[PDB]
Amino acid sequence: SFVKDFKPQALGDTNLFKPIKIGNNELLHRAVIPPLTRMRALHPGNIPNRDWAVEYYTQRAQRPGTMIITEGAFISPQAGGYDNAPGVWSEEQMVEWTKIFNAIHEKKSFVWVQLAVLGWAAFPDNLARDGLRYDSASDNVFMDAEQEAKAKKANNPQHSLTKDEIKQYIKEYVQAAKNSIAAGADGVEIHSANGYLLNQFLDPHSNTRTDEYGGSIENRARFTLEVVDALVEAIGHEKVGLRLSPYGVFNSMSGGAETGIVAQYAYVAGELEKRAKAGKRLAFVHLVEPRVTNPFLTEGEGEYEGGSNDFVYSIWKGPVIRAGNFALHPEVVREEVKDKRTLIGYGRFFISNPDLVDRLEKGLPLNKYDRDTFYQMSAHGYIDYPTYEEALKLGWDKK
Amino acid sequence: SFVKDFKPQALGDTNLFKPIKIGNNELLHRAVIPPLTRMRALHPGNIPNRDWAVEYYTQRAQRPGTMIITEGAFISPQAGGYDNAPGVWSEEQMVEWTKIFNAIHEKKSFVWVQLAVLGWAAFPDNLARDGLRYDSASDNVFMDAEQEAKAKKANNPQHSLTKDEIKQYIKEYVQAAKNSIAAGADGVEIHSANGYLLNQFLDPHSNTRTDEYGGSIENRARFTLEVVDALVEAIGHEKVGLRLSPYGVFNSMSGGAETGIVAQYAYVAGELEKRAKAGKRLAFVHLVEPRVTNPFLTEGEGEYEGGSNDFVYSIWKGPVIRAGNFALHPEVVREEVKDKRTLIGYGRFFISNPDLVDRLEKGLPLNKYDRDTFYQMSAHGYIDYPTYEEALKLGWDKK
Ligand SMILES: Cc1cc2nc3c(=O)[nH]c(=O)nc-3n(C[C@H](O)[C@H](O)[C@H](O)COP(=O)(O)O)c2cc1C
Ligand SMILES: Cc1cc2nc3c(=O)[nH]c(=O)nc-3n(C[C@H](O)[C@H](O)[C@H](O)COP(=O)(O)O)c2cc1C
Ligand SMILES: C=C(C)c1ccc(C)c(O)c1
Ligand SMILES: C=C(C)c1ccc(C)c(O)c1
Ligand SMILES: [Cl-]
Ligand SMILES: [Cl-]
Ligand SMILES: [Cl-]
Ligand SMILES: [Cl-]
Ligand SMILES: [Mg+2]
Ligand SMILES: [Mg+2]
Ligand SMILES: [Mg+2]
Ligand SMILES: [Mg+2]
Ligand code: NA
Ligand code: NA
Ligand code: NA
Ligand code: NA
Ligand code: NA
Ligand code: NA
Ligand code: NA
Ligand code: NA
Ligand code: NA
Ligand code: NA
């Protein structure tokens, strides 16, 4: 069915429908698919779904010139810990990714691989089964009681990374980025948001380190910036973006309750702009809005009203993708895209509307999403959401 | 004469004319007199002007319930270096300040002493004459060539403060604050703006130190925050505000060209909010806007468009005074004061309009200022600017 109470607005008369170049890619509009984990990858080996993933991405690439950021993809076994999320370290994975990237390109769209590392959000028992550590910035603060208890039961207590282990992750980011580009991706997004490993280093709640990787703004940002620099060196700044969620609380991040949080993220933005002014400007910065501090709460819930991401624009002068509860709020998008370097990521409603871009241009009803199939080993709720035309044929204009 | 091309707007229907409490003071409107050095203090001894200063402040206190921040006042001889700016360290100075504070209070207005320390902006020859150092954060970067050369000619090369000398300044801030309160002031403003000593520590251009007072965001902010904490302890948070100019370039500060500048100031704001949440909220934060990066350039010049101070509001949750080119821009004020904790400082046009507040409420023409008498040892251009009524009697409605 269509979302019942929604009053759509046609956005074709806004900058959402003006072309923009991101990295090497000439986008034809500014509605971006943000990274969306869907848990269709198969075990063993974290293999992108051999039956459905091509079709899923093909559907969502249908509007020419769309920027797609993939679901988070683990850079190595040690970076993972969910059996049904894909990786980008093995030949068998890249065989499937190549098919996905080809299909998106055949639709005249673009694809950026999000490089993911879980840290304390991983399942310690899966990691123990596979002979892997349970990693984070620190060893004396935990995501929650259940995770801490699972780690102890698995004889896999949370481990504070050594400097050498940080260097090994960086080597894996580099190789994962190389693999992604070689398989045909247009670029990569470094996931430093949503309370995963890099964010665990950025945040003073999760990072109690007293070495050069914690204990100050510069030190907490060090790992993220080392990954940035390593990937810029390996594959070029034009093929690299960075995702941040300054006000996020998901995965036990601090959000606005931490009075130093804006300074922490302003420092990162400044360091990116410094690199840009020195000739190495990242393709984009992707921000999760305080509109959505936890993406598993219904739209309108978990909204933080005490802060804005606008500060980033005073600092970083390149493209900015903003995501969080924009599908239901065309009135907000209309204002945000008056800024000529702003793109809008649409997450949950791209799950349910493969033709979302047409719907945004034309002010059409939106298909309701089914949260129960966000993570599910099924084609259902993955590749069977209808286009607007198909929904009309199903009678949804009368459901 | 009145400013020729100005189209006034009545602001009486805005929050500029709603009461607000700042520290202990019940303001009746939100038009603030920011600190304005006028150079009428007499030498020797940096004595507030015995002939005219009472009248100057009395005139500008005339609208009941006005917050006045004094001209910068040196906390000690070593903090000074301009012969005609006043101090707040001696009995002879405080005799005159007491008369000024009494007069402002008789007009049912309020007065906050700005505590000033010059650092590298001081004249090294005046300091040498008086047996004093020429101080800054560092000893290897200078305000400009002329200052460096004057220092060398005076056998008074710029001196990087030792930790003990920083502690001695802090002792002087404390005593100056105590003196101010004992003489009747309502509070003090710590001057950490406009490229004076504390700002020389905040800014990475002027602060090349490698000890705990430089080399990182936290370290560069240390002196400012130590002064904050010392004054909060001595006289109470309700009697202390802080002035900052994130985007200022006056006195060779970095402004927006420094990509880390927003992070530097966001850190300070965060540390203030941390103290506030722990029970010690400063009375206000006073920001100079990027509208005016140098207050000795005509309105509209030196405007930085690449940054906003709005980030501060995501961090600090108390009152904010904003200053910079607002008199000529009632349309901008009308928007800014929709925020219910925003006050507006009017500097240059308070020099020329003793009854500025009435003029703002009622949308009246503004007296043109005479920059030549901003700094002058004269009553002329100090206490002889007319009220609106007096200007009409002089025929200015036809000049
Ligand atoms: C099912 C689901 C999976 C997600 N997976 C990821 C992910 O892999 N990487 C990521 O950075 N964000 C992920 N997110 C967050 C989204 O990219 C997005 O920031 C968030 O859903 C808010 O945007 P929206 O309101 O348009 O959905 C996910 C969100 C959902 C609901
Ligand atoms: C003559 C003059 C003297 C000033 N003296 C001081 C001072 O003592 N302390 C201070 O913090 N700012 C000082 N300022 C800066 C003003 O407080 C204010 O921030 C600036 O003039 C911008 O506001 P305006 O456009 O309303 O004048 C001075 C400005 C002028 C023009
Ligand atoms: C990479 C993974 C598995 C993932 C899952 C959910 C979210 C919100 C996310 O940011 C990342
Ligand atoms: C305290 C002094 C003498 C002073 C003079 C000018 C400006 C802009 C200022 O901030 C301070
Ligand atoms: Cl619905
Ligand atoms: Cl799992
Ligand atoms: Cl004029
Ligand atoms: Cl002088
Ligand atoms: Mg241990
Ligand atoms: Mg169902
Ligand atoms: Mg020396
Ligand atoms: Mg003259
Ligand atoms: Na419409
Ligand atoms: Na199938
Ligand atoms: Na802005
Ligand atoms: Na789950
Ligand atoms: Na269905
Ligand atoms: Na009017
Ligand atoms: Na006289
Ligand atoms: Na705001
Ligand atoms: Na002068
Ligand atoms: Na005159």
Side-chain angles (χ1 to χ4, degrees), chain B residues 55-166 168-357:
Chain B
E55 174 69 12
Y56 170 72
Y57 283 106
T58 297
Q59 290 178 351
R60 283 154 188 73
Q62 64 180 262
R63 180 82 183 221
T66 303
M67 182 181 179
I68 302 180
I69 304 168
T70 70
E71 68 207 277
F74 300 144
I75 64 178
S76 64
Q78 182 60 85
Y82 304 153
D83 287 336
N84 303 119
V88 282
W89 73 83
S90 74
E91 291 187 3
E92 57 183 348
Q93 291 159 351
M94 300 320 297
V95 166
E96 302 304 327
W97 284 118
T98 297
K99 297 173 187 185
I100 291 164
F101 304 156
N102 289 346
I104 292 168
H105 291 146
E106 181 84 328
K107 295 297 187 177
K108 308 176 183 179
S109 286
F110 306 105
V111 59
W112 291 63
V113 179
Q114 184 184 68
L115 303 176
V117 181
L118 294 184
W120 75 12
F123 293 143
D125 51 344
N126 286 347
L127 292 163
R129 174 196 68 201
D130 296 341
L132 299 167
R133 304 187 306 262
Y134 179 45
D135 284 337
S136 192
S138 316
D139 61 19
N140 65 346
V141 49
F142 308 94
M143 176 181 150
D144 64 27
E146 186 172 5
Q147 288 283 76
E148 183 194 10
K150 282 183 174 176
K152 290 183 182 191
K153 185 190 167 187
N155 297 318
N156 206 12
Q158 190 178 293
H159 169 74
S160 176
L161 295 176
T162 66
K163 298 193 191 174
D164 282 355
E165 289 161 350
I166 291 165
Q168 176 61 35
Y169 275 118
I170 296 166
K171 289 184 182 179
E172 294 165 357
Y173 274 108
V174 167
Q175 188 62 57
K178 293 179 181 178
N179 291 346
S180 294
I181 299 308
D186 296 286
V188 303
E189 181 181 79
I190 298 160
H191 192 356
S192 188
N194 301 333
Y196 296 95
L197 185 66
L198 291 179
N199 194 172
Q200 289 152 43
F201 278 77
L202 289 173
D203 196 293
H205 170 66
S206 49
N207 186 344
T208 64
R209 303 171 72 101
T210 56
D211 71 352
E212 63 174 325
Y213 289 92
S216 69
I217 286 165
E218 297 86 346
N219 285 5
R220 285 192 297 277
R222 189 177 305 290
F223 190 176
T224 295
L225 290 170
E226 283 178 354
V227 175
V228 167
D229 290 340
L231 297 193
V232 165
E233 177 62 35
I235 63 165
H237 52 279
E238 73 284 356
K239 302 191 196 182
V240 177
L242 181 66
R243 196 170 205 215
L244 302 164
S245 52
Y247 298 103
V249 300
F250 186 60
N251 286 327
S252 301
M253 299 295 100
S254 292
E258 169 55 60
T259 59
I261 211 69
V262 172
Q264 183 65 66
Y265 286 91
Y267 170 83
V268 173
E271 281 297 295
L272 296 182
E273 189 63 22
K274 190 171 198 161
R275 289 156 172 72
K277 292 167 70 191
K280 295 181 182 178
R281 182 175 294 285
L282 297 196
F284 60 90
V285 170
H286 187 173
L287 302 175
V288 186
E289 292 288 304
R291 298 173 64 71
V292 179
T293 64
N294 176 342
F296 295 101
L297 300 179
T298 303
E299 288 83 359
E301 297 182 14
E303 173 158 12
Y304 177 56
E305 301 190 276
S308 173
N309 280 338
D310 289 354
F311 73 94
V312 171
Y313 288 74
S314 283
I315 306 165
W316 165 253
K317 302 304 184 177
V320 176
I321 309 172
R322 290 175 187 254
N325 195 18
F326 287 124
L328 295 173
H329 292 287
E331 75 284 357
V332 175
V333 169
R334 179 173 294 277
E335 298 315 304
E336 295 292 2
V337 300
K338 289 177 178 179
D339 175 84
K340 292 180 176 179
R341 63 193 168 97
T342 296
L343 304 85
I344 303 294
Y346 293 95
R348 284 166 285 180
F349 282 93
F350 241 127
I351 290 179
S352 59
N353 294 270
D355 62 335
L356 184 62
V357 183

Side-chain angles (χ1 to χ4, degrees), chain A residues 244-290:
Chain A
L244 302 164
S245 52
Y247 298 103
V249 300
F250 186 60
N251 286 327
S252 301
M253 299 295 100
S254 292
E258 169 55 60
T259 59
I261 211 69
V262 172
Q264 183 65 66
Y265 286 91
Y267 170 83
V268 173
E271 281 297 295
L272 296 182
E273 189 63 22
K274 190 171 198 161
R275 289 156 172 72
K277 292 167 70 191
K280 295 181 182 178
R281 182 175 294 285
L282 297 196
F284 60 90
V285 170
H286 187 173
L287 302 175
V288 186
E289 292 288 304

Side-chain angles (χ1 to χ4, degrees), chain A residues 1-19:
Chain A
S1 61
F2 296 146
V3 176
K4 272 296 186 173
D5 290 313
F6 178 57
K7 302 178 188 177
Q9 200 194 105
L11 292 164
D13 63 338
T14 76
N15 286 333
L16 194 69
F17 285 90
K18 284 291 189 187

Side-chain angles (χ1 to χ4, degrees), chain A residues 95-166 168-387:
Chain A
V95 166
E96 302 304 327
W97 284 118
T98 297
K99 297 173 187 185
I100 291 164
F101 304 156
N102 289 346
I104 292 168
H105 291 146
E106 181 84 328
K107 295 297 187 177
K108 308 176 183 179
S109 286
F110 306 105
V111 59
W112 291 63
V113 179
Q114 184 184 68
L115 303 176
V117 181
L118 294 184
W120 75 12
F123 293 143
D125 51 344
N126 286 347
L127 292 163
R129 174 196 68 201
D130 296 341
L132 299 167
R133 304 187 306 262
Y134 179 45
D135 284 337
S136 192
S138 316
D139 61 19
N140 65 346
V141 49
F142 308 94
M143 176 181 150
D144 64 27
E146 186 172 5
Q147 288 283 76
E148 183 194 10
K150 282 183 174 176
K152 290 183 182 191
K153 185 190 167 187
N155 297 318
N156 206 12
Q158 190 178 293
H159 169 74
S160 176
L161 295 176
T162 66
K163 298 193 191 174
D164 282 355
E165 289 161 350
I166 291 165
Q168 176 61 35
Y169 275 118
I170 296 166
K171 289 184 182 179
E172 294 165 357
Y173 274 108
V174 167
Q175 188 62 57
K178 293 179 181 178
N179 291 346
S180 294
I181 299 308
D186 296 286
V188 303
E189 181 181 79
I190 298 160
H191 192 356
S192 188
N194 301 333
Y196 296 95
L197 185 66
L198 291 179
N199 194 172
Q200 289 152 43
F201 278 77
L202 289 173
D203 196 293
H205 170 66
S206 49
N207 186 344
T208 64
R209 303 171 72 101
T210 56
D211 71 352
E212 63 174 325
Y213 289 92
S216 69
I217 286 165
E218 297 86 346
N219 285 5
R220 285 192 297 277
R222 189 177 305 290
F223 190 176
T224 295
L225 290 170
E226 283 178 354
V227 175
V228 167
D229 290 340
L231 297 193
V232 165
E233 177 62 35
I235 63 165
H237 52 279
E238 73 284 356
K239 302 191 196 182
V240 177
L242 181 66
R243 196 170 205 215
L244 302 164
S245 52
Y247 298 103
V249 300
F250 186 60
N251 286 327
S252 301
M253 299 295 100
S254 292
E258 169 55 60
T259 59
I261 211 69
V262 172
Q264 183 65 66
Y265 286 91
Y267 170 83
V268 173
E271 281 297 295
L272 296 182
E273 189 63 22
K274 190 171 198 161
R275 289 156 172 72
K277 292 167 70 191
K280 295 181 182 178
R281 182 175 294 285
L282 297 196
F284 60 90
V285 170
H286 187 173
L287 302 175
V288 186
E289 292 288 304
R291 298 173 64 71
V292 179
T293 64
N294 176 342
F296 295 101
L297 300 179
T298 303
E299 288 83 359
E301 297 182 14
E303 173 158 12
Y304 177 56
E305 301 190 276
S308 173
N309 280 338
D310 289 354
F311 73 94
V312 171
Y313 288 74
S314 283
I315 306 165
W316 165 253
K317 302 304 184 177
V320 176
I321 309 172
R322 290 175 187 254
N325 195 18
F326 287 124
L328 295 173
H329 292 287
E331 75 284 357
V332 175
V333 169
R334 179 173 294 277
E335 298 315 304
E336 295 292 2
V337 300
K338 289 177 178 179
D339 175 84
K340 292 180 176 179
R341 63 193 168 97
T342 296
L343 304 85
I344 303 294
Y346 293 95
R348 284 166 285 180
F349 282 93
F350 241 127
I351 290 179
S352 59
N353 294 270
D355 62 335
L356 184 62
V357 183
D358 286 346
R359 301 186 190 214
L360 294 169
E361 182 187 1
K362 300 171 200 185
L364 306 178
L366 304 181
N367 293 353
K368 182 190 176 298
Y369 62 70
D370 179 53
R371 72 182 177 186
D372 291 349
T373 50
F374 282 1
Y375 287 3
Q376 191 94 212
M377 182 54 65
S378 63
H380 180 53
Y382 187 53
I383 56 166
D384 66 348
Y385 286 103
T387 61

